[PDB]
Amino acid sequence: IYATPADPKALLSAAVATSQGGGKLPESFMSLWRFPHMLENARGMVSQLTQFGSTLQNIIERQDAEALNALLQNQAAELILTNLSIQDKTIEELDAE
């Protein structure tokens, strides 16, 4: 009476989101400067902000891309070790022959 093996099973994982809302605005300050001037200044500050934002986006991508490189490299190492065990059994088989 042969016993049939169970089906291979699928794996799964969760990827639950986190959440942080945004900030509140700080209190207003009445600058000594007229509007056309302050507008340009604000424009300058935002532009510098967008520049940092862009810069961060690239850093972020590099961080994650690198983590992947490390992961893949570690995975390759684990699989090789397994393949070495297999090859040794292959040699043994030949001795059996």
Binding site: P26, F52, I59, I60, Q63, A70, A77, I80
Partner: protein, 49 residues
């Protein structure tokens, strides 16, 4: 195969020992993010002004 194992470990040592390793990017990310946030508050205040 043993040779490949050695090469693989070397490649890893490279990934970890080369200058632009994971640590660099986490270091940079955290540092810039801190700057960026502070910069935002200043920019906002300026915008409000």
């Amino acid at each position: 195969l043993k040779t490949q194992q050695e090469q693989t470990q070397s490649q890893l040592a490279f990934l970890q020992r080369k200058f632009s390793n994971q640590a660099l990017y986490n270091w940079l990310r955290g540092r810039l993010a801190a700057i960026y946030f502070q910069f935002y508050d200043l920019a906002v205040a300026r915008c409000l002004m």
